[PDB]
């Protein structure tokens, strides 16, 4: 939708080396604003964006206690799952949780999710109606029956449809200058002589936000996906993103190829040429 | 803000 808030939780067991490592991050759209790392020194939920720093001590004290208990729950899950799959305590395992909500143009609820993974594979997830569960294997069906008998889905829906949406609105308002911004891509093109008969054109897009972007190549105005390379979107480090797309062109006819950039800050796609 | 303490599997 128009905006979203998402939280990511990961626990990695360390058999014979200490308690599992717990890392939690929160994101509003493409911006991270909170973190927790069990190996870090603070042992608290820490801010990672300016607009969240204005929350009072009740916020930070409460969030610290909540993620800590969350890590404790994962400590129990890591051992329980070993019994579900009859696994030994000599190997390292990881659990991953992820939830959040999407909102529409009116900042009202649109979509919710809450999914759980074990060793990198889907384990159990809340369906789109926020009222049923999707179990992967036999072990997940035991978790499903327990969470159904505990009426867990009813309580998760109240967060995803309620608190999640309400506090997403709050963050969007407190961080309007940062979250409600849109940075159009800064574009340019480079040329690289591969040999006497071929040349590579690289179409650049930099300093854009949010990360959603599309780069396509065209020859004589028709789409051309052959001999085209498209790198995955990468973070610039200052809150923006980078992406480029390349194409191999017979030497002499580079003027027949155009690059097209589609982004939220461009009402019409930008066109890039070499000459 | 995060949800309440989750249930164990």
């Amino acid at each position, epitope marked *: 939708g128009s905006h979203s808030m998402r939280y990511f939780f990961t626990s990695v067991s360390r058999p014979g080396r200490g308690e599992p490592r717990f890392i939690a991050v929160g994101y509003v759209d493409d911006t991270q604003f909170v973190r927790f790392d069990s190996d870090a020194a603070s042992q608290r939920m820490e801010p990672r964006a300016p607009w969240i720093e204005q929350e009072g001590p009740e916020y930070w004290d*409460g969030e610290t206690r909540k993620v800590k208990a969350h890590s404790q729950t994962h400590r129990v899950d890591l051992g329980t799952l070993r019994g579900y799959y009859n696994q030994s305590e000599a190997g390292s395992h990881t659990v991953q949780r992820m939830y959040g909500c999407d909102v529409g143009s009116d900042w009202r609820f649109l979509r919710g999710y809450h999914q759980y993974a074990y060793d990198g594979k889907d384990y159990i997830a809340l369906k789109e109606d926020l009222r049923s569960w999707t179990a992967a294997d036999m072990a997940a069906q035991t978790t499903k029956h327990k969470w159904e008998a505990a009426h867990v889905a009813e309580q998760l829906r109240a967060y995803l449809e309620g608190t999640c949406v309400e506090w997403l609105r709050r963050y969007l308002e407190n961080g309007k200058e940062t979250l409600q911004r849109t940075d159009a891509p800064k574009t340019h093109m480079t040329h690289h002589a591969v040999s006497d008969h071929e040349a590579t054109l690289r179409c650049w897009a930099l300093s854009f936000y949010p990360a959603e972007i599309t780069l396509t190549w065209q020859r004589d105005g028709e789409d051309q996906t052959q001999d085209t390379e498209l790198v995955e979107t990468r973070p610039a480090g200052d809150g923006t993103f980078q992406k480029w797309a390349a194409v191999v062109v017979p030497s002499g006819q580079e003027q027949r190829y155009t690059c097209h950039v589609q982004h939220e800050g461009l009402p019409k796609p930008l066109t890039l040429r070499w000459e | 803000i995060t949800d309440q303490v989750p249930f164990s599997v």
Partner: T-cell receptor, first 111, second 111 residues
Framework: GITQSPKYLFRKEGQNVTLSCEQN?????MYWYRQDPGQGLRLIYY???????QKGDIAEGYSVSREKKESFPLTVTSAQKNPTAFYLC???????????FGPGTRLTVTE | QKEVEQNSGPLSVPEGAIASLNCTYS??????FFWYRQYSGKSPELIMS????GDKEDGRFTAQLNKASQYVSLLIRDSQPSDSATYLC???????????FGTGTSLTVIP
């Protein structure tokens, strides 16, 4: 479920008393409230997990310990000015979940 | 003010009629809403729990939630003598990881 002893206690002012509370519901959070006649509940102390506890609103004159997950003993010290109250113990799955109270203890302290 | 507020004044309703108890709260990431019953000299008993806007029916009970107006209510159908007690409103708080109780409303049905 959750129990607290004794149902009625009667002591003389100047010494400390220990109110017991135990639950086998596998609950991490445990709470101590007191209640006056015609009044509401007032939080004294609570614990999110073992080996930890946080002062409530009227913690002055009270102290708690959480050495084990199932026990949460409350101590009424001589510093508490109005120890006579109905004391209630509760536990829950977490800080934001519904709490289940114990039977309660009526403490009366006289000169 | 307080996080959870309900008029504690004694409410009297004719037996067999409808008994409605109101409760208003200050939103603190409030997501879960509960009703407790408490008889004289007894401990609070959980009787009702609601999580989404609308009416939740359970026997002669009916819990109503309107998060937009920050309002939780409880409706008792066919008021009986056993319904005379103090009803406590409880609202959780994801901000701070807390669980707040109201002061309670004493209800007595008249025969």
């Amino acid at each position: 479920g959750i129990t607290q002893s004794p149902k009625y206690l009667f002591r003389k002012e100047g010494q400390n008393v220990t109110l017991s509370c135990e639950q086998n519901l596998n609950h991490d959070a445990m709470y101590w409230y007191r209640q006056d006649p015609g009044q509401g509940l007032r939080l004294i102390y609570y614990s999110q997990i073992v080996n930890d506890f946080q002062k409530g609103d009227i913690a002055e004159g009270y102290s708690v310990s959480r050495e084990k997950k199932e026990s949460f003993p409350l101590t009424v010290t001589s510093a508490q000015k109005n120890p006579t109250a109905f004391y209630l113990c509760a536990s829950s799955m977490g800080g934001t979940y519904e709490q289940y109270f114990g039977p309660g203890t009526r403490l009366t302290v006289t000169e | 003010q307080k996080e959870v507020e309900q008029n504690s004044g004694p409410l009297s309703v004719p037996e067999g009629a409808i008994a409605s108890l109101n409760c208003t709260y200050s939103d603190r990431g409030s997501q879960s809403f509960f009703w407790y019953r408490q008889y004289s000299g007894k401990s609070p008993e959980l009787i009702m729990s609601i999580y989404s806007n609308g009416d939740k029916e359970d026997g002669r009970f009916t819990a109503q939630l309107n998060k937009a107006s920050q309002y939780v209510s409880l409706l008792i159908r066919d008021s009986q003598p056993s319904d005379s007690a103090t009803y406590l409103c409880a609202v959780n708080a994801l901000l701070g990881n807390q669980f707040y109780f109201g002061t309670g409303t004493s209800l007595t049905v008249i025969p």
